[PDB]
Design a protein around this ligand. Structure first.
Ligand SMILES: [Mg+2]
Ligand SMILES: [Mg+2]
Ligand SMILES: [Mg+2]
Length: 765
């Protein structure tokens, strides 16, 4: 017979069968995955910081004396060999939480009699320990994942350029007005326009020794090319320097124009080729709880964008986005769940939204669509999302951000250097470009899987699915009619989950709510019922103490986290025996806080384990209070508790305080608030007639996109010749007379050889 143990024997991962460039290259070629002609880049060499950044010399109080820049002669080919953990030879990297499991089993045995509701917790945790494993996966899994990305983009349902499907930059931007309302960059709104290099984004206000405008980047993530094996914090100076140089070289090429008889293309192609590496990401293997059976066939990838490319794109993206908290909870008609938080009465409000008689109705967050239809809740995901994204998808997103975010009442708050970068360079850098895995520079299909960088592109993709959903009279998500939306758009999607009779099930939560922390203020004997909405990973349960619905983390997610904790990740001179225990207090208490409090055995076992570490440290004299000062950064669930300034306690009071309703933040939209909902906008757009609500800046961006790269400064001017003649009254009749004006100056680029394509081909020469 079979063995089956109470505690599974230490798992030994299989040998990675693609641990060689030779082997990997074979696999990619065998699947028709494209391997690029290897590009090389100059060796990094020292240079005085005073010389490269003279304007940032005043860092003489409280920089790094020299900088390492890709300037020295002798080219090298870049190499990225990430470590996979666990592995066959080093298997003990991330052990399952056996101490937790033993404690749960222990407490179950202490219970006088029976109870299978309790035992289900021990079963579920055990099943996770057996089936899954936390780690970096394998090269074989990464490569294998990539072939799936190519299949999404070029196989079953090949990607479609939205502009060749009737959509325009403006009509898309009018849809994003509803599904992603955006304001101006800013409290008080004192922000600078997109007209300067990153160096001058720090201002020496008041002479004789600083206002900070640069987007925030986390100092611990990898720098990327040209600094493999270095972090963003270690390359801050370098990141600015390269961005400066690139943007300065760009503004020269536009200042110089296209020259006589196009004798300046060489200068453009020269530059783009020299900065090829700005379009090459590192295939970082993402660490998560993969299941053992697919350890060799699925490993999620993070496309580590080079820091200059990130900095420049986030200079366009972040000042707008970190200042637009506009969602379903503060704008009527709005389906966006952007910056939604389930605490502070947040979840109750979504549940009340569901209970409302209205249907069909949709909610969006990036690559997530939630739909209630015929009293059924549908949770929908785009297949790989990023993989479906084309360059025109992103340049449409860029058009939207610059139009509604970086424009004062029609007027552009951006120069032509930033306009040309956003419309014609940035999408080519990040979508359908390349990545460096081992020593191999290989193509990426669609956008690379970031998670912050990919938000707006994915949200756009879903917005199109939503528009298309409206156009065919809002069919039931499971129907054939709904499924035909992916054949029409080239975007892959699938129903992740559906709950029949959603309103009845939600209502029943009020009746069947058990005693607990939020109902009677006691330690729960039994789990209180939930509806597993998976609303951004959150479920709904009812609180009798507060009289409202309160969030509990999705049950599978909760027990998936409980089974395999994330690693510490680097521990230098900072203590020794204290840190290991201290992290466990964080681990166990944070588990309770997100939803462990609802699950009697998990709640009690976590409480005991945390209390055990807490008492040990308290007798040892560890500064635990000072440690937990920003526990938010130390926990994998910390994001949801950011700026909340609340202690790790998980009591009746703390849980009630965490959920006590607070009025939603006032919306910040740069234009008069639209409250018509998406359904109406979809029909107004299908007619073909719609107003150019972008203003002048929209005509500037249409000219920049629709003409040649080097003739960008002429493009703005020709669009201003149009703006001075007052018609606006229809976008299409306006858009076509602009295309003629571009043909009158011979600046309009040839079909299939657009400004965006030319820079794509230039990036690998
Ligand atoms: Mg979803
Ligand atoms: Mg997706
Ligand atoms: Mg996303």
């Amino acid at each position: 017979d079979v063995e089956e143990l109470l505690i599974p024997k230490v798992w030994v991962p299989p040998e990675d069968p693609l641990a060689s460039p030779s082997r990997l290259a074979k696999f990619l070629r065998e699947n028709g995955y494209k391997v690029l002609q290897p590009r090389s880049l100059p060796e990094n060499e020292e240079y005085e910081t005073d010389q490269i950044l003279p304007d940032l010399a005043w860092m003489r109080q409280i920089l790094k004396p020299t900088l390492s820049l890709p300037i020295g002669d002798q080219e090298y080919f870049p190499k990225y060999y990430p470590t996979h953990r666990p592995s066959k030879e080093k298997p003990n990297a991330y052990p399952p939480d056996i101490a937790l499991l033993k404690q749960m089993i222990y407490l179950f045995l202490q219970v006088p009699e029976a109870n299978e509701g309790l035992k289900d917790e021990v079963t579920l945790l055990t099943q996770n320990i057996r089936d899954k494993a936390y780690g970096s996966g394998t090269y074989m899994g990464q490569a294998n994942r990539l072939v799936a990305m190519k299949e999404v983009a070029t196989g079953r349902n090949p990607n479609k350029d939205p502009l060749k499907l009737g959509y325009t930059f403006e009509s898309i931007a009018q849809l994003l007005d509803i599904t992603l309302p955006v304001g101006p960059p800013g409290d008080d709104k004192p922000w600078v326009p997109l007209t300067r290099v990153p160096s001058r984004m720090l201002v020496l206000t008041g002479d004789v020794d600083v206002e900070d405008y640069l987007p925030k980047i986390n100092l611990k993530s990898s720098s990327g090319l040209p600094y493999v094996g270095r972090t963003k914090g270690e390359t801050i100076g370098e990141m600015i320097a390269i961005s400066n140089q690139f943007l300065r070289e760009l503004s020269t090429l536009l200042k110089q124009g296209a020259g006589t008889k196009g004798s300046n293309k060489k200068k453009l192609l020269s530059m783009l080729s020299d900065y090829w590496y700005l379009s090459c990401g590192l295939l970082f293997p993402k660490a998560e709880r993969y299941d053992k059976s697919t350890w060799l066939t699925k490993t999620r990838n993070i496309w580590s964008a080079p820091s200059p490319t990130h900095l420049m794109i986030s200079m366009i993206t972040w000042p707008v986005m970190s200042n637009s908290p506009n969602n379903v909870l503060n704008i009527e008609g709005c389906p966006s769940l952007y910056k939604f938080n389930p605490f502070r009465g947040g979840l109750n409000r979504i549940v009340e939204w569901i209970l409302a008689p209205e249907e069909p109705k949709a909610l969006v967050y990036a690559d997530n669509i939630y739909i209630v239809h015929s009293n059924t809740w549908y949770s929908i995901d785009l297949e790989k999302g990023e993989a479906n994204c084309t360059r025109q998808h992103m340049q449409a997103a860029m058009y939207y951000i610059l139009t509604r975010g970086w424009s004062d009442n029609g007027d552009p708050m951006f120069n032509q250097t930033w306009a040309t970068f956003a419309m014609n360079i940035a999408p080519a850098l990040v979508v359908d470009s390349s990545c460096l895995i081992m020593n191999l520079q290989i193509k990426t299909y669609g956008q690379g899987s970031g998670n912050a960088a990919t938000f707006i592109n994915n949200h756009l993709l879903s917005t199109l699915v939503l528009d298309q959903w409206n156009l065919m009279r809002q069919p039931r998500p499971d129907s054939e009619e709904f499924k035909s939306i992916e054949d029409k758009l080239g975007i892959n999607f699938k129903i992740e989950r559906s709950i029949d009779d959603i309103r009845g099930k939600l209502r029943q939560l009020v009746l069947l709510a058990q005693p607990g922390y939020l109902s009677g203020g006691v330690e729960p004997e039994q789990s209180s019922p939930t509806v597993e909405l998976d609303l951004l990973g959150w479920s709904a349960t009812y609180s009798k103490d507060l009289g409202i619905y309160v969030p509990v983390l999705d049950k599978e997610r909760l027990f998936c986290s409980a089974a395999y904790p994330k690693g510490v990740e680097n521990k230098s001179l900072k203590s020794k025996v204290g840190i290991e225990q201290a992290y466990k207090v964080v681990r166990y208490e944070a588990l309770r806080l997100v939803g462990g409090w609802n699950y009697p055995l998990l709640n009690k076992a976590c409480k005991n384990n945390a209390g055990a570490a807490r008492r040990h440290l308290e007798a040892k004299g560890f500064p635990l209070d000072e440690f937990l000062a920003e526990w938010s950064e130390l926990s994998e669930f910390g994001e949801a508790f950011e700026g909340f300034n609340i202690k790790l306690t998980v009591t009746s009071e703390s849980l009630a305080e965490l959920n006590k309703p607070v009025p939603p933040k006032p919306p910040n939209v740069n234009r008069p608030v639209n409250t018509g909902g998406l359904k109406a906008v979809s029909n107004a757009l299908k007619t073909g007639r719609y107003r150019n609500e972008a203003g002048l800046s929209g005509l500037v961006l249409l000219a920049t996109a629709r003409s040649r790269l080097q003739d960008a400064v002429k493009a703005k001017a020709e669009a201003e010749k149009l703006h001075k003649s007052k018609p606006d009254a229809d976008w299409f009749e306006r858009s076509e007379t602009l295309s003629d004006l571009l043909e009158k100056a011979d600046i309009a680029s040839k079909v299939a050889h657009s400004a965006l394509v030319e820079t794509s081909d230039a990036l690998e020469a």
